[PDB]
Amino acid sequence: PTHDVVGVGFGPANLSLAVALEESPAALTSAFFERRASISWHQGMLLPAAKMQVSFLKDLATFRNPASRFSFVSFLHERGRLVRFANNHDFFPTRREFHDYLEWAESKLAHEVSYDSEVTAIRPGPGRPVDSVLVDVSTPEATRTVEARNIVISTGLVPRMPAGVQSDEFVWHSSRFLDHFRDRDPRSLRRVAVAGGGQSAAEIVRFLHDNRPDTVVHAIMPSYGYVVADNTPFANQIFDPAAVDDYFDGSKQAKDAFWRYHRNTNYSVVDDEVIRDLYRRGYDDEVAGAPRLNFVNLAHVVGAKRIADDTRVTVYSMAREESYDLDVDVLVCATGYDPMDPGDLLGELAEHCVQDAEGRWQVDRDYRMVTTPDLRCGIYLQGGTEHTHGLSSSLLSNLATRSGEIVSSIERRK
Amino acid sequence: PTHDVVGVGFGPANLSLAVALEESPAALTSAFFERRASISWHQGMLLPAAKMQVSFLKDLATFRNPASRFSFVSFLHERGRLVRFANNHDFFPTRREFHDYLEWAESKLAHEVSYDSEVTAIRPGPGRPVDSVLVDVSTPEATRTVEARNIVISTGLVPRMPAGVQSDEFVWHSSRFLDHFRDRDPRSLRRVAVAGGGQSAAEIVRFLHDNRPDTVVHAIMPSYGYVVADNTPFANQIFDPAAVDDYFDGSKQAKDAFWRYHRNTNYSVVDDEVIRDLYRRGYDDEVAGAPRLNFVNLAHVVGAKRIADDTRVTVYSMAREESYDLDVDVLVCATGYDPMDPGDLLGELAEHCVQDAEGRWQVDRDYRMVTTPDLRCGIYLQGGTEHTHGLSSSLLSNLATRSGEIVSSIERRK
Amino acid sequence: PTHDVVGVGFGPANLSLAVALEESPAALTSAFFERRASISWHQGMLLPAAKMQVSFLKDLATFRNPASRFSFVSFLHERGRLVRFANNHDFFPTRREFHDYLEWAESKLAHEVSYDSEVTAIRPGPGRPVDSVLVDVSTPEATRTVEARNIVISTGLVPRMPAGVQSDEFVWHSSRFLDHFRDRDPRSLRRVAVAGGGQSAAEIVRFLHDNRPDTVVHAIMPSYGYVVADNTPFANQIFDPAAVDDYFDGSKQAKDAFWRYHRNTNYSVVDDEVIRDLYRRGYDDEVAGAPRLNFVNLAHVVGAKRIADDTRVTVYSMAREESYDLDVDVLVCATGYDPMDPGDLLGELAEHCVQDAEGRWQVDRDYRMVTTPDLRCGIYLQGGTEHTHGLSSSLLSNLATRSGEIVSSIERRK
Amino acid sequence: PTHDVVGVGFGPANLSLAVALEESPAALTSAFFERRASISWHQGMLLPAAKMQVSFLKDLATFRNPASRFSFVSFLHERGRLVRFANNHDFFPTRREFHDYLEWAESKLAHEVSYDSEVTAIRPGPGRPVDSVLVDVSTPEATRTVEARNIVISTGLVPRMPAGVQSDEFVWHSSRFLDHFRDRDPRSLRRVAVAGGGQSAAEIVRFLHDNRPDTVVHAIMPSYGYVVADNTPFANQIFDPAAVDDYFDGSKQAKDAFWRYHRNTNYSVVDDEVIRDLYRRGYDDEVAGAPRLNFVNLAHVVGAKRIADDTRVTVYSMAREESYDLDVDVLVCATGYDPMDPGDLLGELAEHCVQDAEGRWQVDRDYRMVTTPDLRCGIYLQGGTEHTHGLSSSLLSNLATRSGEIVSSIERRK
Ligand SMILES: Cc1cc2c(cc1C)N(C[C@H](O)[C@H](O)[C@H](O)COP(=O)(O)OP(=O)(O)OC[C@H]1O[C@@H](n3cnc4c(N)ncnc43)[C@H](O)[C@@H]1O)c1[nH]c(=O)[nH]c(=O)c1N2
Ligand SMILES: Cc1cc2c(cc1C)N(C[C@H](O)[C@H](O)[C@H](O)COP(=O)(O)OP(=O)(O)OC[C@H]1O[C@@H](n3cnc4c(N)ncnc43)[C@H](O)[C@@H]1O)c1[nH]c(=O)[nH]c(=O)c1N2
Ligand SMILES: Cc1cc2c(cc1C)N(C[C@H](O)[C@H](O)[C@H](O)COP(=O)(O)OP(=O)(O)OC[C@H]1O[C@@H](n3cnc4c(N)ncnc43)[C@H](O)[C@@H]1O)c1[nH]c(=O)[nH]c(=O)c1N2
Ligand SMILES: Cc1cc2c(cc1C)N(C[C@H](O)[C@H](O)[C@H](O)COP(=O)(O)OP(=O)(O)OC[C@H]1O[C@@H](n3cnc4c(N)ncnc43)[C@H](O)[C@@H]1O)c1[nH]c(=O)[nH]c(=O)c1N2
Ligand SMILES: NC(=O)c1ccc[n+]([C@@H]2O[C@H](COP(=O)([O-])OP(=O)(O)OC[C@H]3O[C@@H](n4cnc5c(N)ncnc54)[C@H](OP(=O)(O)O)[C@@H]3O)[C@@H](O)[C@H]2O)c1
Ligand SMILES: NC(=O)c1ccc[n+]([C@@H]2O[C@H](COP(=O)([O-])OP(=O)(O)OC[C@H]3O[C@@H](n4cnc5c(N)ncnc54)[C@H](OP(=O)(O)O)[C@@H]3O)[C@@H](O)[C@H]2O)c1
Ligand SMILES: NC(=O)c1ccc[n+]([C@@H]2O[C@H](COP(=O)([O-])OP(=O)(O)OC[C@H]3O[C@@H](n4cnc5c(N)ncnc54)[C@H](OP(=O)(O)O)[C@@H]3O)[C@@H](O)[C@H]2O)c1
Ligand SMILES: [Br-]
Ligand SMILES: [Br-]
Ligand SMILES: [Br-]
Ligand SMILES: [Br-]
Ligand SMILES: [Br-]
Ligand SMILES: [Br-]
Ligand SMILES: [Br-]
Ligand SMILES: [Br-]
Ligand SMILES: [Br-]
Ligand SMILES: [Br-]
Ligand SMILES: [Br-]
Ligand SMILES: [Br-]
Ligand SMILES: [Br-]
Ligand SMILES: [Br-]
Ligand SMILES: [Br-]
Ligand SMILES: [Br-]
Ligand SMILES: [Br-]
Ligand SMILES: [Br-]
Ligand SMILES: [Br-]
Ligand SMILES: [Br-]
Ligand SMILES: [Br-]
Ligand SMILES: [Br-]
Ligand SMILES: [Br-]
Ligand SMILES: [Br-]
Ligand SMILES: [Br-]
Ligand SMILES: [Br-]
Ligand SMILES: [Br-]
Ligand SMILES: [Br-]
Ligand SMILES: [Br-]
Ligand SMILES: [Br-]
Ligand SMILES: [Br-]
Ligand SMILES: [Br-]
Ligand SMILES: [Br-]
Ligand SMILES: [Br-]
Ligand SMILES: [Br-]
């Protein structure tokens, strides 16, 4: 049994793909494999006040199909919370509500996703030219192989630790913050260092500040203060379907300009509202004569070691061009992520995939990897297209159109 | 040929009815009559900056059917403006865009509306009990009569001038502001009086101030300054479908409480942003040493007379308890509207319509007039239900659910 | 030793008076008596997030003297927080910071206030015409009498409980909320009823929601939902110095118009941001499937009784026109305040104070009670002038100008 | 006659110096020379809606002296506009009002400024050690020389045109926009090109769009849309007095970090509000079917030539890597400014001024140029300290403290 398309991973990207498949009149067979027991959308960072960074209109389908049964609005309606939501006049749902939306959409699908199923490799199917791929799937009990004419890789961002710092029992990456934080006896995390100046760093500091009154927090970041995230309307355009065209067709000089001017729309920046809230907290503590937030600016974390009952963080100060130590109970590294790497699961098939001068996967407009004539199977990327398709690659801005484009591509080639 | 339902008037209310009819699986025949040449939704007040007072999610259908082909979101999509609109992050479209939406929805309808068709009377059909009504329709060429088992009256708010003031060539009601303003020579309206403290009054003054630099404006209103419109989420809940029930099923005492506390959600009030804009304009003029906005507070317009080339406005000052005369080129009365009244159109049928103690029409929860057993035809009201259904009656807050309940009622009784 | 002026009470109003006295070139002797141990400015309601309802520019002096050593700006500067405050771009300080400001201003004063000193009576001095008043002061150790040519009564708002509800250990007035709440066992206040729809009611509910995850709260109020406080620039003009004149010189009809239209600037209303925050909390709880905020609208508390371990609150529902019982651990009545009344303190002197038709004190523009020729001493009111001077009487909007006018009046008559 | 200090230029910077001198108890003689007829603070860009980029609290003196007779608040009070201003709740005055403030402050000043007086050179005074400088002043009638022990150079930003483009009758720099625009016939500027993506560019485009309904505008900028200006509280800390020290004492690495992360607080960026307003304008035009704003992104103006009745603008597109022409009536270059440079004015004294490795002027913390032993006179810079003191150098953020430090330095050396 050969599937038209197999999806690796089941986060929002492949979920929108599943939705696109179901709404398409094309009869395409599919299977999706997710390593986790269920949809798990950055749960480590599902903090109490966390808000979506995108508008609810930017959901799984609406931009493609304004009357989708899978729209966020449909979700609200079924949950009897559309009227209440509209009264709030906030375009940005909470992360918690959105996570619910995902699970609701997944349930509504006719198709059934295979959970607890980790794709370990993707191999050339039999014959030349290669007309199918073999997908090696590991479940807790067994292992098996499924065959597919096309494959869509959507395995998500990859946590990035500072150079020279390894995650450990008292050194956490932000992605696994709540995982670790639930364990730990409250009276044992009185001193926390948080590395980073981005959205993750800010949210974690805010959470620590609100959730227990006596925690002392060291916010260590290279900038002089949080840099504001740019969500102004002209800016939000870089995420419009048509802007993806602009970026794709543009010269390397144009692509650079994109990053040079508009990297602030997403990377190493903090939403305006979160910034103000942190500032208000700092101000009120000063008034109360009880400072707890220590902003260590123009600095990086360059090392961590456990010494007795204290995690010793080595900080490099740019202002003084000197390193020094910082003893705390826990170091949380909110130091960001690396892009999805298409090459991960590809071994041999990577031989048939085409790189450019600088070594990067070549990708067609329809998110399909460029291959030699030895490969006729479609390898599509949702994620890992930062170089070719732009800033929207890892984000939720363009789920509907990207998924739709991929489905159409697959139908066209069938 | 007897129709299941005939709609009198084709503003947003009956348009949502037409949509509800089309989306309903029930096979109901219908005709709609509009006296104008086309949909004309308060065009006299389609000022440059005018913004909807209701969220785009409150459209013709979405609250009833979250995936309607007639949703505002569908409209944006077809116009290729959904992405752009979402980037704006504003829940409130312009009046101009919304007017487009209505025309777009009307065109989509399978059914064809009869324009240039004024309903002049509604009369008892033949027989007893009365099982149909006769609808007298006047077109430019002819007159005719069509028969219907149910009728839905939605003829809109009725302009209300101040007592003792009649509309005239230099005394206008706000509803016909642009109609009269586009005609006049700019250099002839250097002095304008605007009566009222509501949304209409404020928008007109703002428009006059922005449009031409030398117009002097007298803003005459009973309050000491504009009163802010309440659109905070809890007060807004009075427009929830469920709040209609609360109002309907509530005692007279409870109904009175709605008006006493929440009349400021709509009547005699001005949107926060419009108020601030006017204030900024006044401030900047003062700085420039060139005042043009004269706020005449705690006052009422009590008369107008044309004297040579001047419109003389008689103003009563509450502070002073005396009247005085104000000479301008034009008096614009933004003094509001009276509710729809099915009274005039009904004639003989009114005999079979039951009134309450205070002589008002009794109306069922499904918007259907209470009748004697002599009358079995449904007379539904969209508008004119302020006293039975509450503050949502004349507004856009509840189009989807009201229209849906009327359609269901008609189907149930068939 | 006869003082030119004696101040009864030392809240913000008399503090601004003290400041006005010191800044005036006039050499006037004074004494101030405060019953409490120190300045105590609604400490029972000093909740964590509470924000001033008035701009920092509306402080003790700035409107009168734009370069006062007692300005809020001077306070920030001395505290080394001015730059930090300006960066925040918020016109509204916290209540906690403002309380600090008051104490700071009090300390800076040359004059020394007499604390722990309750004024128990004000009596006619010796002679005719009565030329001085005698002020009976009770300290913890002794009692004494001081003599003054003028007296300024500023004893503040008086807590008002719902009719037929008396405060006790499980039935609190909002004014003493933190007094009772602190140290009460957390696990013993799992069910709280809060009566009222005003700023106090809203802040307490929000605090309860924020500070304890388990607490179930019943918000009981006569309106259908919180009514927004009007702070828009034009309505806010009623607090301008010149608007005091407009109100004072205006007819009874005009005065009524102020209250009819602009009572929503202060009474029985809630700040926009606090409303939205409560709504967001309610929404998120619904999403989480854990409702805790119960809004009991169109209702009022009509009785309370202690029954075993429960406080039984009798609620009257306007919608149903019936009464029912609600069991909670504590009833907090945030039911507002009555105006200051010089009546009690005055005794005999009241004979020489002229009343108008409705039993109310006549007051001159300069806040000086109207007296018979039998009395030449100045009795000034800061507070209790709602009926003569308007909505600014109990508020912080006009401290600088009122205090300045009182000082000037006293100097003029000397 | 030898002055303690001579100021070159009389914009806000030297105005604050004059104020600092006055308020200082030190008896220092001074003269100020301005080449214009009066204070002329970027009048070419005094557009109708233009708003200060800095809080009113950041005025001539307040941060140094919180009760200055020259504060913005004092200004408002004297103008009888303090109450009205506070009611507006806007920290940011209009540029128009601020310009008034400057003139008002100038008039208050006890000592008189010499207008129509252009400093043409600064020379070594006679003898050894060099204890004075000679200032060559050219008035319309005569020329003269004044002597001073110290000199403060504050001659402002210098307009910068694109490379290969020269200002002309139909090619304007933004700084002279209104100067040229008030002259031209309206019907002759139907096609305008505006180069730049900064605050100047945005304001001019907005003005052109609002002013006349039929102007077509080409907005040419290197970014893919306007980049938001960062004004959030933490990033704004870079303008704190203490942040000057951090920048000054910091390594080159640290200084680079300030620019790398926080350049977006001021350069090549646009205020949030202005961006949103432009976007709304674009949206409404599309709805109206009448587009007029053409955003030419990822592009640079590289040339301009007059050809008959057309200004032909050569545009380089980074996306296509090619150049093309656009014909308009006028090209406005809003392409920014170069820093103040004491270089030109200094001449021979420059020999006595020490440069660093990269050939830049070495400046002490007090703003005083580093000199050779023979030179004992103080040469202070207000402006032109970007490389030593940081991003505050050309701005209004720090007038009070900088001026105060310079005055103190002069007194201390005296
Ligand atoms: C805390 C936080 C919050 C947000 C965001 C990031 C972070 C860290 N993002 C960006 C983020 O990339 C986005 O929200 C989604 O996670 C992207 O969807 P994906 O399906 O592509 O990755 P995603 O990570 O969601 O899905 C990957 C899945 O594949 C599974 N998987 C990986 N390898 C596998 C294998 N070998 N076999 C089987 N399964 C495998 C993983 O288990 C995982 O479930 C965002 N962006 C935005 O625009 N707005 C927003 O609000 C947010 N919110
Ligand atoms: C300037 C302005 C702006 C707004 C609003 C009012 C005003 C004055 N409204 C309220 C307004 O009532 C609502 O928007 C609709 O007009 C109501 O729809 P009807 O369909 O009920 O009115 P209208 O929309 O008033 O429908 C009546 C129509 O029937 C026609 N008609 C009358 N008599 C007839 C006859 N005898 N025969 C045939 N046709 C006849 C009329 O010609 C008219 O077209 C509003 N509310 C809100 O909630 N949000 C908002 O943004 C606005 N905007
Ligand atoms: C929780 C809360 C918060 C606010 C406000 C009210 C409340 C309840 N207000 C209004 C409030 O009225 C105002 O802030 C001041 O309290 C009024 O000053 P007095 O100085 O007039 O009152 P208070 O400030 O009430 O002055 C009274 C003092 O006199 C003392 N006293 C009474 N009788 C005495 C006696 N016989 N002998 C000696 N001393 C006696 C009392 O002890 C007390 O210290 C307000 N308004 C606004 O415009 N903005 C705001 O932010 C707020 N904030
Ligand atoms: C349109 C616009 C608007 C703003 C700003 C810039 C621009 C272009 N700025 C920055 C701007 O640099 C600042 O507002 C002041 O102009 C700087 O003060 P200066 O006194 O140093 O220069 P400024 O240019 O104001 O004054 C210099 C003066 O010296 C005179 N002069 C020059 N050479 C001379 C000579 N040889 N002899 C005699 N006189 C001579 C000139 O005539 C001129 O009047 C700003 N920044 C901010 O933080 N907030 C804001 O709101 C603004 N607003
Ligand atoms: N509420 C939400 O929906 C939410 C929450 C969290 C994250 N997200 C999303 O997830 C994505 C990533 O955000 P992110 O904050 O996790 O990552 P991020 O944007 O890459 O931010 C990483 C930060 O850590 C800094 N850093 C790197 N090495 C460091 C070191 N050795 N010491 C100190 N700081 C160091 C980076 O500084 P430099 O770049 O200057 O080197 C940067 O400030 C974004 O798309 C974001 O929007 C969303
Ligand atoms: N942008 C939009 O979508 C828009 C624009 C305009 C209107 N509308 C809507 O249309 C409806 C009507 O609003 P409206 O502003 O036209 O009317 P309105 O709300 O009824 O207000 C009428 C005003 O005139 C005053 N008034 C009455 N008699 C007067 C007199 N003799 N002299 C001076 N003033 C007098 C009223 O004062 P009192 O009430 O105190 O007596 C009131 O302030 C509302 O639903 C509104 O939201 C919407
Ligand atoms: N309302 C106000 O108070 C107000 C008004 C206007 C200005 N200002 C102030 O004045 C100062 C300067 O602002 P500004 O906007 O005048 O200048 P600016 O910040 O320097 O911005 C100049 C812009 O022109 C661009 N540019 C450079 N060469 C170009 C070319 N050949 N073709 C097209 N575009 C080109 C720059 O792009 P790149 O830099 O990316 O190369 C940049 O976006 C700031 O302090 C600003 O805040 C204040
Ligand atoms: Br968005
Ligand atoms: Br719903
Ligand atoms: Br690193
Ligand atoms: Br560890
Ligand atoms: Br970890
Ligand atoms: Br949190
Ligand atoms: Br492009
Ligand atoms: Br540290
Ligand atoms: Br796409
Ligand atoms: Br698509
Ligand atoms: Br709404
Ligand atoms: Br679209
Ligand atoms: Br009319
Ligand atoms: Br307008
Ligand atoms: Br109810
Ligand atoms: Br309904
Ligand atoms: Br329905
Ligand atoms: Br205020
Ligand atoms: Br400070
Ligand atoms: Br109590
Ligand atoms: Br709180
Ligand atoms: Br619930
Ligand atoms: Br007063
Ligand atoms: Br005064
Ligand atoms: Br403008
Ligand atoms: Br600022
Ligand atoms: Br004033
Ligand atoms: Br250039
Ligand atoms: Br040039
Ligand atoms: Br030219
Ligand atoms: Br020029
Ligand atoms: Br530093
Ligand atoms: Br030519
Ligand atoms: Br400094
Ligand atoms: Br200083």
Strand residues in B77-157 grouped as ranges (E):
118-124, 133-138, 143-148, 150-153
Helices (H) and strands (E) in chain C, counts: 11, 18
- What whole-number distance in Å separates Cα of residue B274 and Cα of residue B206? 8
Helices (H) and strands (E) in chain A, counts: 12, 16
Give partners of A (≥3 CB pairs < 8 A): B, C, D
Helix axes B199-211, B272-288, angle to 10 degrees: 40
Q: Is the CB of B13 under 6 A from ligand 2?
A: yes
Q: What is the DSSP letter of A362?
A: P
- What whole-number distance in Å separates Cα of residue C333 and Cα of residue C198? 11
- The pair of structure tokens assigned to C316 is 């009257």
Residue C258 Cα to ligand 30 middle (Å): 17
Give me the phi and psi of A6, to 5 degrees please. Answer: -115, 130
- What whole-number distance in Å separates Cα of residue B16 and Cα of residue B399? 6
Q: What share of chain A is helix, strand, coil (3-state, %, to 5)?
A: 35, 25, 40
From residue C162, alpha-carbon distances to C251, C321, C335, D352 in Å are 32, 18, 7, 82
Interface test with C, best of D60, D69, D87, D265 (most C CBs within 10 A): D87
Give me the phi and psi of B211, to 5 degrees please. Answer: -65, -60
Sign of CA dihedral D57, D63, D64, D66: positive
Q: Are D60 and D17 in contact (CB under 8 A)?
A: no
Strand residues in B129-223 grouped as ranges (E):
133-138, 143-148, 150-153, 158-159, 171-173, 191-195, 216-220
Give me the phi and psi of A54, to 5 degrees please. Answer: -125, 155
- What whole-number distance in Å separates Cα of residue B191 and Cα of residue B292? 10
Q: Is the CB of D45 under 6 A from ligand 7?
A: yes
Q: Are D152 and D380 in contact (CB under 8 A)?
A: yes
C57 to D82: CB separation less than 8 angstroms, yes or no: yes
D94 to B287: CB separation less than 8 angstroms, yes or no: yes
Strand residues in D19-174 grouped as ranges (E):
30-33, 118-124, 133-138, 143-148, 150-153, 158-159, 171-173
C-alpha distance across the termini of chain D, in Å: 17
Q: Are D235 and A225 in contact (CB under 8 A)?
A: yes
From residue B18, alpha-carbon distances to B72, B77, B116, B350, B402 in Å are 16, 21, 18, 26, 12
H-helix segments, D65-153:
72-78, 82-88, 95-108
- The pair of structure tokens assigned to B32 is 């709609």
Q: Is the CB of A134 under 6 A from ligand 5?
A: no
Q: Are D90 and D57 in contact (CB under 8 A)?
A: no
- What whole-number distance in Å separates Cα of residue B102 and Cα of residue B72? 9
Q: Note down the domain range covering B192.
A: 1-414
Which technique was used to obtain these atomic coordinates? X-ray
Q: What is the DSSP letter of A89?
A: T
Torsion angle of alpha carbons C40, C44, C49, C50, nearest 10°? -60
For chain A, the domain total comes to: 1
Q: What ligand 2 atom has the least distance to the C-alpha of B394?
A: 12
- What whole-number distance in Å separates Cα of residue B66 and Cα of residue D380? 68
Phi-psi region at D232: left, alpha or beta (left = phi > 0; alpha = psi -120 to 50): beta
Q: What is the DSSP letter of A94?
A: B
Q: Are B371 and B144 in contact (CB under 8 A)?
A: no
Our CA angle for B371, B374, B378, nearest 5°, is 45
**Tokens 């309610």 found at:** C282
Helix (H) or strand (E) holding A236: helix A233-236
Residue of D nearest to B213 (CA): D211
- Contact status of C237 with chain B (Cβ, < 8 Å): yes
**Tokens 């809606």 found at:** D49
- What whole-number distance in Å separates Cα of residue D410 and Cα of residue D403? 11
Strand residues in B293-409 grouped as ranges (E):
293-296, 299-307, 310-317, 322-328, 330-333, 337-338, 378-381
Q: Is the CB of D53 under 6 A from ligand 4?
A: yes
D36 marked as part of a ligand binding site? yes
B197 marked as part of a ligand binding site? yes
Give partners of C (≥3 CB pairs < 8 A): A, B, D
- What whole-number distance in Å separates Cα of residue A118 and Cα of residue A144? 11
Q: Is the CB of C176 under 6 A from ligand 3?
A: no
- The pair of structure tokens assigned to D206 is 């907005």
Strand residues in D334-402 grouped as ranges (E):
337-338, 378-381
List beta partners, residue A133.
A124, A148
Residue A202 Cα to ligand 13 middle (Å): 10
Resolution (A): 2.4
Q: Strands A330-333 and A191-195, how do they pair?
A: parallel
Q: The domain spanning residue D297 has which CATH number? A: 3.50.50.60
- What whole-number distance in Å separates Cα of residue C158 and Cα of residue C386? 14
Q: Strands D171-173 and D322-328, how do they pair?
A: unpaired
Q: Is A395 helix (H, G, I), strand (E, B) or coil?
A: coil
Q: Is the CB of A266 under 6 A from ligand 5?
A: yes
- The pair of structure tokens assigned to C302 is 């009509």
- The pair of structure tokens assigned to C44 is 């029972």
Asked if omega into A93 is within 30° of 0 (cis), the reply is no
Q: Are B237 and C283 in contact (CB under 8 A)?
A: no
- The pair of structure tokens assigned to B49 is 């900056």
Which residues make Cβ contacts (< 8 Å) with residue A292, sequence separation at least 6? A209, A214, A215, A216, A217, A285
Q: Work out the number of other CB atoms within 10 angstroms of the CB of residue D382.
A: 28
- Contact status of D233 with chain C (Cβ, < 8 Å): yes
Q: Whose CA is nearest to atom 33 of ligand 6?
A: B300
From residue A161, alpha-carbon distances to A276, A304, A331, A385, C202 in Å are 27, 11, 11, 22, 44
- What whole-number distance in Å separates Cα of residue A299 and Cα of residue A316? 6
C233 to D66: CB separation less than 8 angstroms, yes or no: no
- What whole-number distance in Å separates Cα of residue D82 and Cα of residue A280? 27
**Tokens 């420059």 found at:** D350
- What whole-number distance in Å separates Cα of residue D212 and Cα of residue D215? 6
- The pair of structure tokens assigned to A175 is 């992605």
Task: Count how many residues are written for chain A.
Answer: 414
Q: Are B331 and B313 in contact (CB under 8 A)?
A: yes
- The pair of structure tokens assigned to A260 is 């040079």
From residue C178, alpha-carbon distances to B59, C48, C184, D43 in Å are 46, 11, 10, 56
Helix (H) or strand (E) holding D200: helix D199-211
Dmax of chain A from CA atoms? Answer: 75
Give me the phi and psi of D220, to 5 degrees please. Answer: -110, 120
D228 to A235: CB separation less than 8 angstroms, yes or no: yes
Burial class (CB in 10 A: 0-12, 13-18, 19+), B290: exposed
From residue C324, alpha-carbon distances to A343, C294, C320 in Å are 69, 16, 10
Burial class (CB in 10 A: 0-12, 13-18, 19+), D137: buried
- What whole-number distance in Å separates Cα of residue C156 and Cα of residue A361? 75
Which residues make Cβ contacts (< 8 Å) with residue A244, sequence separation at least 6? A389, A390, A392, A398, A401
- The pair of structure tokens assigned to D194 is 């505006």
Q: What share of chain C is helix, strand, coil (3-state, %, to 5)?
A: 35, 25, 45
Q: Are D169 and D304 in contact (CB under 8 A)?
A: no
Which residues make Cβ contacts (< 8 Å) with residue B189, sequence separation at least 6? B181, B215, B329, B330
Closest ligand to residue B170's CA: 20
- What whole-number distance in Å separates Cα of residue D305 and Cα of residue D313? 7
- The pair of structure tokens assigned to A324 is 């020094």
From residue B151, alpha-carbon distances to B23, B287, B347, C32, C115 in Å are 19, 58, 14, 76, 77
Sheet with strand D322-328: strands edge to edge? D299-307, D310-317, D322-328
Q: Whose CA is nearest to atom 28 of ligand 6?
A: B335
From residue A175, alpha-carbon distances to B222, B382, C383, D68 in Å are 59, 54, 57, 52
Residue of A nearest to C282 (CA): A84
